Amino acid sequence: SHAVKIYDTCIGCTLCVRACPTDVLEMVPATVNAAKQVASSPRVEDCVGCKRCETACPTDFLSIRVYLQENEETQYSLGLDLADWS
Amino acid sequence: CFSSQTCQDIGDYLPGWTGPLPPVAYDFPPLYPAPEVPYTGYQAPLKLM
Amino acid sequence: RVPGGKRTKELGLVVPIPEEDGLTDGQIAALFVVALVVLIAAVDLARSLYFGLQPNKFKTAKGKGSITPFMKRLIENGF
Amino acid sequence: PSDEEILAKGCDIRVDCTTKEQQFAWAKAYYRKYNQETDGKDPKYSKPSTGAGVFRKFKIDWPNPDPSIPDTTDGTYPIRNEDFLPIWKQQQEDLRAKMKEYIGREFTEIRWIGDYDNARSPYKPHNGYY
Amino acid sequence: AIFRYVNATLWSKAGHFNKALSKGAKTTTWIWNLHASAHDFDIQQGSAGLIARKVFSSGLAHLSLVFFWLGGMHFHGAYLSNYSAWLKDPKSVAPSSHIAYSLVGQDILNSYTSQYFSGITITSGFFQLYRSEGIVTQSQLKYACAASLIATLICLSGSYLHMQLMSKFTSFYKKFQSLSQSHLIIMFGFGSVSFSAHQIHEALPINSLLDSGIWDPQLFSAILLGTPSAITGKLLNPSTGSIFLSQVAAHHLAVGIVFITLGLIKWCNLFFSRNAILSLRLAYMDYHAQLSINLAVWASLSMVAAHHLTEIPVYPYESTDYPTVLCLFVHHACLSGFFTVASGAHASIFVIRQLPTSEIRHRDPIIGHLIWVCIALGLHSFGLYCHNDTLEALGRPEDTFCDNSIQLKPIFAKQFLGLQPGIEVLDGKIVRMTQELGTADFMVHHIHAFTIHVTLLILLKGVLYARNSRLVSDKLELGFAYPCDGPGRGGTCQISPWDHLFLAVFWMYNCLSVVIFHYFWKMQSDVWGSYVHHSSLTCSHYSQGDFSVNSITINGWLRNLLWSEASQVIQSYALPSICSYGFIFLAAHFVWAFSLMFLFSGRAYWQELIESILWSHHKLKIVPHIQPRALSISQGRAVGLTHYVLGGIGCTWAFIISRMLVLTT
Ligand code: CLA
Ligand code: CLA
Ligand SMILES: CC1=C(C#C/C(C)=C/C=C/C(C)=C/C=C/C=C(C)/C=C/C=C(C)/C=C/[C@@]23O[C@]2(C)C[C@@H](O)CC3(C)C)C(C)(C)C[C@H](O)C1
Ligand SMILES: CC1=C(/C=C/C(C)=C/C=C/C(C)=C/C=C/C=C(C)/C=C/C=C(C)/C=C/C2=C(C)CCCC2(C)C)C(C)(C)CCC1
Ligand SMILES: CC1=C(C/C=C(\C)CCC[C@H](C)CCC[C@H](C)CCCC(C)C)C(=O)c2ccccc2C1=O
Numbered sequence A: 001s002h003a004v005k006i007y008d009t010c011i012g013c014t015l016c017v018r019a020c021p022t023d024v025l026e027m028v029p030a031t032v033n034a035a036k037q038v039a040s041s042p043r044v045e046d047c048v049g050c051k052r053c054e055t056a057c058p059t060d061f062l063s064i065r066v067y068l069q070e071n072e073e074t075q076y077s078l079g080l081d082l083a084d085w086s
Numbered sequence B: 001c002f003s004s005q006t007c008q009d010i011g012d013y014l015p016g017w018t019g020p021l022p023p024v025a026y027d028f029p030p031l032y033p034a035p036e037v038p039y040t041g042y043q044a045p046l047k048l049m
Numbered sequence C: 001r002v003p004g005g006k007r008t009k010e011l012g013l014v015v016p017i018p019e020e021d022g023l024t025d026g027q028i029a030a031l032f033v034v035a036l037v038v039l040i041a042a043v044d045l046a047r048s049l050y051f052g053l054q055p056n057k058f059k060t061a062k063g064k065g066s067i068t069p070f071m072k073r074l075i076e077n078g079f
Numbered sequence D: 001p002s003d004e005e006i007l008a009k010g011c012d013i014r015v016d017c018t019t020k021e022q023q024f025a026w027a028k029a030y031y032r033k034y035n036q037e038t039d040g041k042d043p044k045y046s047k048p049s050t051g052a053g054v055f056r057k058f059k060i061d062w063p064n065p066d067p068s069i070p071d072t073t074d075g076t077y078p079i080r081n082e083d084f085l086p087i088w089k090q091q092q093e094d095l096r097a098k099m100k101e102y103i104g105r106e107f108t109e110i111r112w113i114g115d116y117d118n119a120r121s122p123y124k125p126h127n128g129y130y
Numbered sequence E: 001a002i003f004r005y006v007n008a009t010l011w012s013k014a015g016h017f018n019k020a021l022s023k024g025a026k027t028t029t030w031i032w033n034l035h036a037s038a039h040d041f042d043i044q045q046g047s048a049g050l051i052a053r054k055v056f057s058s059g060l061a062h063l064s065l066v067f068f069w070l071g072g073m074h075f076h077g078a079y080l081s082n083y084s085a086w087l088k089d090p091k092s093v094a095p096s097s098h099i100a101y102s103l104v105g106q107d108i109l110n111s112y113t114s115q116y117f118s119g120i121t122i123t124s125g126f127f128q129l130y131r132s133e134g135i136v137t138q139s140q141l142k143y144a145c146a147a148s149l150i151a152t153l154i155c156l157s158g159s160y161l162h163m164q165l166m167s168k169f170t171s172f173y174k175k176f177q178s179l180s181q182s183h184l185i186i187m188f189g190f191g192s193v194s195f196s197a198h199q200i201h202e203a204l205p206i207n208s209l210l211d212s213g214i215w216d217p218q219l220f221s222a223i224l225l226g227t228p229s230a231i232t233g234k235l236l237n238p239s240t241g242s243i244f245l246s247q248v249a250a251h252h253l254a255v256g257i258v259f260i261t262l263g264l265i266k267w268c269n270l271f272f273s274r275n276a277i278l279s280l281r282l283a284y285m286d287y288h289a290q291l292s293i294n295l296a297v298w299a300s301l302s303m304v305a306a307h308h309l310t311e312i313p314v315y316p317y318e319s320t321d322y323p324t325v326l327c328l329f330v331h332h333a334c335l336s337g338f339f340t341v342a343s344g345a346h347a348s349i350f351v352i353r354q355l356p357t358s359e360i361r362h363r364d365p366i367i368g369h370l371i372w373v374c375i376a377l378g379l380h381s382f383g384l385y386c387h388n389d390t391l392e393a394l395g396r397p398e399d400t401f402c403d404n405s406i407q408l409k410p411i412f413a414k415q416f417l418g419l420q421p422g423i424e425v426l427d428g429k430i431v432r433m434t435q436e437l438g439t440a441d442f443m444v445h446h447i448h449a450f451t452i453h454v455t456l457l458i459l460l461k462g463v464l465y466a467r468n469s470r471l472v473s474d475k476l477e478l479g480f481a482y483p484c485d486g487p488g489r490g491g492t493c494q495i496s497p498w499d500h501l502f503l504a505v506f507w508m509y510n511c512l513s514v515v516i517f518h519y520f521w522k523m524q525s526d527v528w529g530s531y532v533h534h535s536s537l538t539c540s541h542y543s544q545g546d547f548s549v550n551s552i553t554i555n556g557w558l559r560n561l562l563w564s565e566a567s568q569v570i571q572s573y574a575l576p577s578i579c580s581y582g583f584i585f586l587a588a589h590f591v592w593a594f595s596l597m598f599l600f601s602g603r604a605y606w607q608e609l610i611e612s613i614l615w616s617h618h619k620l621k622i623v624p625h626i627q628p629r630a631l632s633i634s635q636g637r638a639v640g641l642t643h644y645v646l647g648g649i650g651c652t653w654a655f656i657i658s659r660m661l662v663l664t665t
Helices: A015-019 A052-056 C006-011 C025-051 C069-077 D003-009 D020-034 D084-103 E008-012 E028-037 E048-079 E083-088 E126-133 E138-165 E176-212 E245-267 E275-283 E287-311 E322-353 E358-394 E439-464 E497-526 E554-565 E579-600 E603-619 E633-664
Strands: A003-006 A026-029 A037-040 A064-067 E430-432 E530-532 E536-540
Touching: A003 A037, A015 A052, A052 A064, D003 D020, D084 E176, E048 E126, E048 E138, E083 E126, E126 E176, E176 E245, E287 E322, E322 E439, E322 E497, E322 E633, E358 E439, E358 E554, E439 E497, E497 E554, E497 E633, E554 E633, E579 E633
Parallel strands: none
Antiparallel strands: A003 A064, A026 A037, E530 E536
C-alpha cells in the first residue's frame, strides 16, 4: 500500500478529502491552524495513489504527500476488478 | 454476369439492349415543327442520336 | 564460401579451412571435465549467494569461530 | 605458375613467402578453387509472375480466370480494342472534314492570350471573330 | 439582426471566449490553452444559440477560405502556367502553374517544362480538370478565378451576417428532415443534373474538337456523336485514354435523377423501416455525432475517390500523367485516414457529452474480439513476411510463401468489369492494364486489413471506454482531454479518448504509409511503364515487375522500394528539377526525428530545466512576468504527434514525387 502523510502546514480546507476517490481521508479537530481541523489518512489501505489530494492541496508545497510503494502493492491499491486477492 | 461469366456487351448485360438508349421501337418525333429555312441566331435543338 | 564483401571479392581474401579438426575427442573431454568442475562449484556459489550470511550459526555450529591474526591487526588499525 | 602447384607449395610468411605479391597470388588461387560467385539459387525465383505477361503459368486464378489477362504465356500483352483505333481515326477525320466544310475556311489556331469578337456582336469587328 | 454589438474591443482581450482564461497571462500555459480552446465553441461563454451561431458562421468562413484557395489556383493556371502549351501537346509538356523566385540561387528550382516556360511541375491534375471542364482560354480561366473570388466574398459576408442574423430563437439548424431533404434533392440531385447539362452543352463539343485536333475560335464559341455501343469503361478514348465525357455526362444525369427519386420517395414516406433507425435518430442529434458521422462518410468517399481516380480513368490524359494520378491517390488516401481518425475523436466527444447508445453495454466482448482479430491478423499476415525473410536468408526459397513456392492464391479476388484481353496504350505509355493478383497481393492485402483493424481497435476502445472503465470509474467526470488520472492503480497514463486518438493517429499513419508503398510499388512494377512492339507488346515497367518477386520479403521492401527507388530523391541535389524535393526529404527526416523528443520525454524534466535557466535571467534582472512553463502533457503529445506525422508524410511525399518526376522526365 501507499503512504499518505499529512503535515502541520495543513490549513483544513477539506479539498483533499473531497477529492478522495476511495475515501481515504477525513478531517479531524485540531488547534494548529485557524480552521481548527486537519485532514487525516486513516484508511490508507484503500489509497490507490492517484494523487488527486495532492492536486487539490493549496499550500505552497503540499501539506499532504502520497508516497508510492510499488513493492507493497495490494489489490485495493491496484484497483483490481476482474481478479480477487481476498 | 460478374465473375464466373464475362459479359462483353450491353445486350449481354440487359436482354434486348444494343445501345446507350433503351430498345424502344418508338421514334420520338418532334413535338413542334422546325423552320425549313433557318435564321441568324437560331441554335437548333440538339439531337441525342 | 560465397563472399558478399566488395573488398573480399576485389582482393581475393580467403577463409582457409584445415584438413583436420584442431582438437581431438580426448582433449574436448578433458575440457568438459574442467567445465563440469566449474559448473559444480558455480552451483554451490549460487546457492551460497542466494542464502546469504547465517548469523544463527553461533548457536549450533561446531567450533567457537576464529579471526585470523592479520584480520585482528587490520581491525585494530581501523579503516 | 598454376593454381594446383601454387596450392601444393602453399604459403608461409614465416619461412619463404615473404613477398606480398606471392601471398596474394596464393590467396587468389585458393579463392578460385574454393569460392563460388553465387549460391546457385534456382533462376525461377527471380522471374516475375504478375505484370510480365506470364501470369497464366502459375495458375493462381484458375477457377473462373479473369478474361482481361492474356492467355498467352510468352510475356507479351496485346493492345485492347485494337479494331477500334482505325475506326476512331476515321470518325475523327470525318468530323474534321464536316466541321471544315461547315465553317467554309481553314481552321485557325486559337490564341491563349488573344481576344476574339463574338460572331453575333453588333459592333464592327476589331479582331476577327474566328 | 442587431449589429451594434460587433466591435473590435474584444479583439485585444485575447481569451474572452473562455472563462478559464479570465486571469490573463500568468504563464505560457495560458497562451497554449487559448490556442487549444479557441475553436471549442461548446465550452465557451454563451448559450446553445451562440454555439450554433459560431458553428454555422465558421463553416461559412471556411467555405470562403476554400473558395479563395480555388480562385488562387485558377489565377495561377491563367497567368502563371503553361496551360496553353500543355493543351496543344499534353504529352511533351508537363503541367506547371508554379514558378519560383531567383532570390538566393532559388531559380534552380524551376525546371524545363516547355520552350518558353520554366517552373515547378504541378501534380494536382488541375490542367486535366480544366480540359475536362472545357476551359481552353485564358479569358475562361480568368472568369473562373473571378467567380471564385466573388464566391469567397459572398461566403465571408454570409458568415459575418449570420453571426448576428441567427438569434437565440434560431432553430433552422435543428430541422434535420428539411436539411437532409434539401441537400438530397437540390444540392445533390439538381446539382448533378445541372452539371450534366453543363458537360453536354459546353465540355462535350470542346472536348470532341480537342480530340479531333480542331483549335478554331468559332468552333470553341449532337450528343453521343463518337461513342460506340461498347459499355462505358470497356472502351477508353483512343486519342485521350479516358472514359468518354458524354458517358460521364449521362452518368451525372442518371445520378441526379436517382437522387431526386430517392428524395421524392422519402418525401412520400415510401421508405418504411423508420423504427430500425429511430434509436440513432433520437441519440445522434448532436454536433459531435453529426461531425463524426460526416467525417467518416467523407473519409470513406475520399478513399473510394483515391482508388477510382486511378483505376477508372475519366480525366483527359490523367492516366498517362503518372505523377498526377499517384499524387491524387496518395493525397485522398491520407485525407481518408485523417478524417476517419477524426470521426473516432468526435464519436468519443459525443459519448462524453451525451448519452451513448446501448451497444456500449456489452463493450467488453466487442473490444475483446477485436483485440483477438487484430492479434491473429497481425500474427499471420506479418509472420508470413517474417517467415519468408528467415527462410530465404537460410537459403530455402522452396519453403517460403511465393508464387513459385508455397502460394496463397486470392481465390475471392474475382473480376467484375469483364474487359477484353490486352492493355490500353496511348503514345508510348500504358494508360490501363489489368492488375494480376498473387501471393504478394494476398499478403499485402491482409497487412492492410490488419492495420485497419488495429486502428479501428484503438478508436473503438477510446469511444466505448470513454465514460468509465474497470480502472477508473469517473472518466466522465475527468472529461475528454486529460493526461491521466494519476500514478495510481499501477498508472493511468493515456486513459482518455484524446490519448486514444493520439495513438490511433500513429496507427492510421502506419496503415496509410503501407498503403501508399503498396500502391506505388505495384503500379510501378505491374501497371505503369512503356511498351515495345494483331500486335503483341513487351511492356517495360518502371520498376521492372519486381513487386511479385521481391515484395514477399521485408528485405525486398527495404531494398527494391526504399533504397532502390530513393536514388532519385537522394541524388537530386545537382538536378534543377528535384533539388527542392531532396532538401525536403532531408528536412522531413529531421522533423520526424525531432518529434521523438516530445514523444519520449516528459513534462517535469523540461520544467526543471526551464527553472534552472530562469535562474540566470532573474540573476541578470530579466524577469518575464508571463512565467515560462513547460508544455502540458497533452500538448507535448500533440506536438510530438504532429511533428512525427508531418516528417513521415514529407519524406514519403518527396520520395515518391522525385521518383515519378525523374522517371517521367
Ligand atoms: C514558399 C513555399 C511554397 C508555396 C507558397 C507554395 C504554394 C503552392 N504550391 Mg507548392 N511547393 C513548394 C513550396 C511552396 N509551394 C516546394 C518547395 C515544392 C517542391 C518543388 C512544391 C511543389 C509543389 C507542387 C508539385 C504543387 C504545388 C502546389 C502549390 C499550390 C498548392 C496550394 C497550397 O499550398 O495549399 C496548402 C497546402 C498545404 C499547406 C499542404 C500541407 C501538407 C503537405 C502536403 C505535406 C507534405 C510534406 C511537406 C511539403 C513537407 C514536410 C517537411 C518540412 C516541414 C521540412 C500553391 C501555389 C500545387 C499546385 O497546384 O500549384 C499551382 C502543386 O501541384 N507545390
Ligand atoms: C482474420 C480476419 C480476416 C480479415 C480481416 C481478412 C481480410 C481480407 N481477406 Mg481474408 N481470409 C481470412 C481471414 C481474414 N481475411 C482467413 C481466415 C482466410 C482463410 C485462410 C482468408 C482467406 C482469404 C482469401 C483467399 C482472400 C481473402 C481476401 C480478403 C480481403 C477481403 C475480401 C475477401 O475475399 O474476403 C474473404 C474473407 C474470408 C474468406 C474470411 C471469412 C471470415 C472469417 C474467416 C469467418 C470465420 C467465422 C466462423 C464462423 C467462426 C470461427 C470461430 C473460431 C473460434 C475458429 C481482405 C484483405 C481476398 C483478397 O483480397 O486477397 C488479396 C482473397 O482473395 N481472404
Ligand atoms: C574402498 C576400500 C578399499 C579399496 C579399494 C580399492 C583397491 C579400490 C581401487 C580403486 C581403483 C583402482 C580406482 C580407479 C579409478 C580410476 C579413475 C577414477 C580414473 C579416471 C580417469 C579419468 C577421468 C581420465 C580421463 C581422461 O584423461 C583421460 C584418461 C584422457 C584425456 O583425453 C581426457 C579424459 C577426461 C578422457 C580398501 C582400502 C581395500 C579398504 C577400505 O576399507 C575400503
Ligand atoms: C472544391 C473541392 C471539392 C469539390 C467540390 C464540389 C465541386 C462540389 C460540388 C458543387 C456543385 C456543383 C454544387 C451544385 C450546386 C447546384 C445547385 C445548388 C443548383 C440548384 C438549382 C436550383 C436552385 C434551381 C433553380 C431553378 C431555376 C434554375 C429557375 C426556376 C426553376 C428552379 C427554381 C428549379 C471537394 C469535394 C473534392 C473537396 C476538395 C475541393
Ligand atoms: C522539448 C519539450 C518541452 C520543452 C519545449 C518547449 C517549452 C517549447 C518551446 C516553445 C517555443 C518558445 C515556441 C516558439 C517556436 C520555436 C522557437 C520556433 C523555431 C523555428 C525555427 C525554424 C527557428 C516540453 O515542455 C515538453 C513537455 C511535455 C512533453 C515533451 C516536452 C518536450 O519534448
